[PDB]
Amino acid sequence: MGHHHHHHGSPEDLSLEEREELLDIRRRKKELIDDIERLKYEIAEVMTEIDNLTSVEESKYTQRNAQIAMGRKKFNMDPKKGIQFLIENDLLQSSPEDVAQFLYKGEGLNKTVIGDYLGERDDFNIKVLQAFVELHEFADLNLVQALRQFLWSFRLPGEAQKIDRMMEAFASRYCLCNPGVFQSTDTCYVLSFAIIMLNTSLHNHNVRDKPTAERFITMNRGINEGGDLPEELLRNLYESIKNEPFKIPEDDGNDLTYTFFNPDREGWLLKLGGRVKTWKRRWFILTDNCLYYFEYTTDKEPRGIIPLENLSIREVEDPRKPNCFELYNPSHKGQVIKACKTEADGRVVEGNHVVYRISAPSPEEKEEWMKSIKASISRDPFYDMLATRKRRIANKK
Amino acid sequence: MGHHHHHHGSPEDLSLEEREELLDIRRRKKELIDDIERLKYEIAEVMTEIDNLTSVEESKYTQRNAQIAMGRKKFNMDPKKGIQFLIENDLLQSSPEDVAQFLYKGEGLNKTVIGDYLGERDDFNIKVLQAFVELHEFADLNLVQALRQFLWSFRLPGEAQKIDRMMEAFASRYCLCNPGVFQSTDTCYVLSFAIIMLNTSLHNHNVRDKPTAERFITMNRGINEGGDLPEELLRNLYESIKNEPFKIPEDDGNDLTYTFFNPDREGWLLKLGGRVKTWKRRWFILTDNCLYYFEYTTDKEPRGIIPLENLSIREVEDPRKPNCFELYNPSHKGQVIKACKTEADGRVVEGNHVVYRISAPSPEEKEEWMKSIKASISRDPFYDMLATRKRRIANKK
Ligand SMILES: O=P(O)(O)O[C@H]1[C@H](O)[C@@H](OP(=O)(O)O)[C@H](OP(=O)(O)O)[C@@H](OP(=O)(O)O)[C@H]1O
Ligand SMILES: O=P(O)(O)O[C@H]1[C@H](O)[C@@H](OP(=O)(O)O)[C@H](OP(=O)(O)O)[C@@H](OP(=O)(O)O)[C@H]1O
Prior knowledge:
Helix content of chain A: 40-55%
CATH class of the largest domain in chain A: Mainly Beta
GO cellular component, one term (chains A, B): plasma membrane
Pfam family, one (chains A, B): PH
Strand content of chain A: 5-15%
Distance between the termini of chain A: 70 Å
Keywords (chains A, B): Cell junction, Cell membrane, Coiled coil, Cytoplasm, Guanine-nucleotide releasing factor, Lipid-binding, Membrane, Tight junction
Order of helices and strands of chain A: HHHHHHHHHHHEEEEEEEEEHH
Strand order of the largest sheet of chain A: 5-6-9-1-2-3-4-7-8
Oligomer: homodimer
Bound molecules: inositol-(1,3,4,5)-tetrakisphosphate
Function (chains A, B): Promotes guanine-nucleotide exchange on ARF1 and ARF6. Promotes the activation of ARF factors through replacement of GDP with GTP. Plays a role in the epithelial polarization.
Number of helices of chain A: 13
CATH superfamily of the largest domain in chain A: Pleckstrin-homology domain (PH domain)/Phosphotyrosine-binding domain (PTB)
Number of strands of chain A: 9
Radius of gyration of chain A: 30 Å
Domain PH (chains A, B): 262-378
C-alpha cells in the first residue's frame, strides 16, 4: 500500500552483515573466555594435587571418599548408626542442620530410609525434619510445584503416624513461604492429600472415575476453614497434575501417590443371607471401613453393619447370581464373622455369617466394589489419620 | 587414636612435573586472553566500519566512573581483589593507611566484606586494621557511645579469632583515647562484651528474663583489674543500651550484637551420692565448663565442684527417680571422676563417683540440662577466649 514506515515483510527486520560478523566475533570471544575458565579450573586442580593432603601413596579412591562411601552404606542399613558413624569420624557435623543438608543432598542414600528416619518421633529427628523442609524453597511455587520438589527428596514411610509428621512439616513450611494463601496449615495439609488422591485418580488405570477440573473444584468445597479456595487456584493445581504425574524416586510402582484410592462407595448389591441363604437387594454404603446395608434408600437405620477389619475378598462362581464375591476371615475358618443386624421385630442382634456372599449388578460394579473394599481395608490407619485431621479442618459454626 | 586438626609439616613439594604443567596451562590461558583481545579489536574495527561519523555521537561515556564502579563491584565479591584493582587503576594508594581510609569511607562497600578483610591475620591487614581504628575518634565518649560508632563502620565477622583481633584493636584505641577510665585493655574488652551481651538480653525476645540496672552493675563486679567500676558509669551504659539498641548497618536480624547469648545455668536438682547412695536436693550452677553444686542458693562455698573436661552425659533409667541423666568418663570406663567436695567436718576431699546421676523435676528440665551440659563440653572458642581474659584481669601481679 502507498504509505510510509511499513516493512510488510517477515516477522524480523533487515540485518546488516557487519553486525552479524560482530555478533559472531562476540560469541567466539565468549567461547575463548569459557576455555580460559576451564584452563584455570584445571590449574587449580593441579595445584591441589601438588599440595600435601594426608593419605597414603597408593590409593584407588581417596580417604575422604572411601570413608564417606562406607558411611552412606551404613546409613542405608541403619540411619541412626550411619549418622553416628559420620559424626564420630568427622565426615559430618553434629547439628540437625548439617544432618539435614546431608539427607537433602542424599548422595548414595536410599530415599525410603531417608523417609523412615525423618518420620521418627525422636527430638533430634524432629529437628532434622524441620531443617530438611527448610532446605526446600517453597516461596512463589504453587502447592503442586512444592509437592513435586518435596516428594523427590525422600519416599513416604508406611506408618500413618510418620506420614503425618512429614506432611505436617511440609504444610507448615509451605504456608510460611506463602502466607495468606491458605487459612490454616490444616487446609494446606488436607488439600495436599486431595492432590495426591487426584494423582492416583488421573494416572492409575485401576481408577475409572477420572474427575474433571469442575469436579475437583466441587470436591474441595469448604476446605479453607469453611470457606472456598479460589477456582483459578484449584484449576492450576488440577491441570498441573493432569499434565504431569508426580515423579517418584526409586519408584517401585507401589507408592502412595500412585495407589491412594477412594475407600468409599455406595450402591445396590444383592447379598446372600447368613443361616438362611436367601438373596436380598440392599442399598450399601462403604464408609469408616464398614459396609452398612439398608432395605430402602430412605431408611434412617441400617439393616446391618459389617466391619471390614481382618476380612479379605475371594471371587466365587454362584449357581444363580452373577458377579459374586465373598467376604471372609482367613484367620478364623468356619467361625461366625463379627457383625450386627436388625431382626423383623427391631431387635439388634449378632450376625450368623461365616461368609458374606455378595452379587454385583455388572462385572464393572463388582470390580469397583472389590477395589473400594480392598483399599479401605489395606490403608485404614492412614484413612483414619486423614479423617481425624479433616474433622479439625471442619469448623463449628 | 585421634589425630590433630591442624597438622605440622616439613617443607617438601615434589610436584615439579605438575608445576611445569600448571605453568604451561597459564601460558595457554595468556594466549587465549591475547586472542580475545584481538577479537575485541576486530569487533571495534567492524563497529567503526558500520558507523558513519556525520558528527560524533553524544552519549556520555565515563571511563573513570566506570573504573570506580568496577573497583567497588570487585571489592564486594573479593576485598583483596577489589583493592588490587583500584591500586592498579590509580584510584587508591597502596599503603595500609590509604587502604584504611578507603574502607573507613566505605562508599558503596559491603560492611560485612569490610569486616572480613579487617579481621584477617595477614601482616598488611593487621596494619590496615590499626589504621582503621585510628580513624575513629573515641575521646570524650563513653564505652557504649564508642561502640555505637565503631559498629557502624563494619559488620563483625563470624570467626572468634577475627572478632578478637578487631575488639582488641578497638579496646586498645578506646583506652588510648580515654586514659584512666579502665585499668587495662582487658577490662575494656570484657566490658565491651558485657555491653554486647546486654544488648542481646534486653532486645532479643528469645531472652525471657531482662536484666535490671542493678543486675548489670553487680554482674560486672571485679572487672576493673579486681576492683569495681563506678556505679554511675555502669548505670549510664545500661540506660543507653536499654533506650536504644545498637544500630547495625545492613542489619539482617542475625548480627552478633543481637545474638550474643549467655549459656550459663542454675537450678535445683536431685543428685545421687557416691559411696553412700543417698539422694540430695542441691543448687547447681554451670559455668566455664564446670558444674558446681551448693546446699543453698546464697552459699559462696560449694558442696562440690565437677570439672566437665573429658566427661560425657547420657540419659539413664533409674528404678525410683524420674528424668535422670548421668555424667561419666567415656574414655576411662569405670574410672572415678576427678572432683572435689566438702565433708561434714569441713574438710575438702576428692569425690568418689564413677558416675554423677542427677534427677530433674520434669522431662523438659532433664532435656534442658542435658543440652546445656553437652554444649558446655563441646565448648565455644569465643566464650573460652573471654573466660581467659577474665582470669587475667587481676589485682596484683
Ligand atoms: O428374609 P429371609 O428370607 O427370612 O432371610 C433373611 C435375610 O436374608 C437376612 O438379610 P437382611 O438382614 O439383609 O434382610 C439375613 O440376615 P443378614 O443381614 O444377617 O444376612 C437372614 O440371615 P439369618 O438371620 O442368619 O438367617 C435371613 O434369615
Ligand atoms: O548426706 P549423706 O546421706 O550422708 O550422704 C552423702 C551425700 O549423698 C553427699 O552429697 P552432698 O555432698 O551433695 O551432700 C555425697 O557426696 P557427693 O557430693 O560427693 O555426692 C556423699 O558421698 P560419699 O562421700 O561418696 O559417700 C554421701 O555420703
